[PDB]
Amino acid sequence: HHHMIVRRATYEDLSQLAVLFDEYRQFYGASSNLEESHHFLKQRFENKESVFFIHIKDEKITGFVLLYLGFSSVACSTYYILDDVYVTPLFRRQGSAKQLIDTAILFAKQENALRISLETQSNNHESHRLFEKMGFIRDSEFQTFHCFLK
Amino acid sequence: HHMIVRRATYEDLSQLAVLFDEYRQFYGASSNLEESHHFLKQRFENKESVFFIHIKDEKITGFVLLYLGFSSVACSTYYILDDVYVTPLFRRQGSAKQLIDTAILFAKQENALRISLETQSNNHESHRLFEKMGFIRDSEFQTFHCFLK
Ligand SMILES: CC(C)(COP(=O)(O)OP(=O)(O)OC[C@H]1O[C@@H](n2cnc3c(N)ncnc32)[C@H](O)[C@@H]1OP(=O)(O)O)[C@@H](O)C(=O)NCCC(=O)NCCS
Ligand SMILES: CC(C)(COP(=O)(O)OP(=O)(O)OC[C@H]1O[C@@H](n2cnc3c(N)ncnc32)[C@H](O)[C@@H]1OP(=O)(O)O)[C@@H](O)C(=O)NCCC(=O)NCCS
Ligand SMILES: CC(=O)NCCCN
Ligand SMILES: [Mg+2]
Ligand SMILES: [Mg+2]
């Protein structure tokens, strides 16, 4: 029996998780649309190489982390991408993101991943403090490029 | 036809492994055709991966490997241009240009938001290539890594 847990998300959690997923999208500039957020959360959940971990405190989902499998051609090995991390404001600064990333790290090690990689906004200093505390090192060697199609 | 940029098939993998091993060596890996081919086949069997090869008179001159990406913010998919390589003998002949032009057409057909990639900051050649193909340098995001091995 427990009162707090970080565990893999299930289909049964998607309805509650969609609210936090919609909040994460709003943080990134998106207009709130619970129905759209939920439909796409279901597509990502039903994607073979994606893994969602959620943080539940007193039966409430406080946050989540979405990871997906990466393939490193140079190393000829897999790794994990920490795609999205979010904690709802009511539960911030209580160690939720820390616990979510700690479980993400233990999971990646269990999967013999090379590393966990991510990209976060340069203007998001709060996230840089979180990732550095968790053992992430800033990549300097690479430059991102986008070719916009729509 | 005498030249073509097309999807890779199972039959191209023995020859494609040689190019993929060459691409690995450019990024500093030791040559190992068995390891290169085994991983190439694992990526080729991934349902979200897409390989295009440039073939000049039955010789593979180069390739591009793309994979599906999900944008949570846009609630839409996109493509990541993961690997691009042209064997030195066939360089500065438009092989990479044709591979990327095909990748863009494929991404548009798939209704992708964009094609995204990462390349070394000191790789002058790749920056000229991607800029020629309409890619824009983006420094609004910072990459972090948590090394496990
Ligand atoms: C960033 C975010 C995930 C942090 O979640 P959280 O549960 O509040 O974080 P924690 O309580 O585990 O904090 C862990 C560490 O992160 C850093 N951190 C977290 N919030 C911070 C803040 N507001 N300012 C500075 N550092 C902060 C600190 O180093 C902190 O350690 P400390 O509290 O001992 O100083 C949360 O604020 C959030 O959802 N933000 C919006 C989405 C986002 O930016 N995600 C990252 C990109 S995917
Ligand atoms: C980069 C690379 C793929 C280019 O392949 P390529 O088939 O020779 O390229 P193309 O002939 O299609 O050239 C397309 C454009 O790229 C640029 N380019 C290509 N080679 C270049 C070079 N040596 N110097 C400068 N710009 C160059 C030019 O803008 C060129 O247009 P142009 O020929 O009209 O001037 C090839 O040099 C290679 O395999 N390099 C090693 C692997 C690599 O760097 N891949 C990317 C790592 S993330
Ligand atoms: C950690 C992080 O990547 N945040 C941006 C969300 C799209 N990847
Ligand atoms: Mg890769
Ligand atoms: Mg994403």
Numbering used by the authors:
A (entry chain A): -2 to 147
B (entry chain B): -1 to 147
What's written in the study?
Here we have uncovered a GNAT-family acetyltransferase conserved in A. baumannii that is responsible for the acetylation of 1,3-DAP in A. baumannii in vivo and in vitro and renamed accordingly as Dpa for diamino-propane acetyltransferase. The crystal structure of Dpa reveals topological and functional differences from other bacterial polyamine acetyltransferases, adopting a β-swapped quaternary arrangement similar to that of eukaryotic polyamine acetyltransferases with a central size exclusion channel that sieves through the cellular polyamine pool. In this study, we have found a downstream regulatory element in this pathway: the polyamine acetyltransferase Dpa that specifically acetylates 1,3-DAP in A. baumannii to control the effective levels of the metabolite. The structure of Dpa revealed a dimeric architecture with a conserved acCoA and an acidic polyamine binding site formed at the dimer interface that shares properties with other polyamine acetyltransferases.
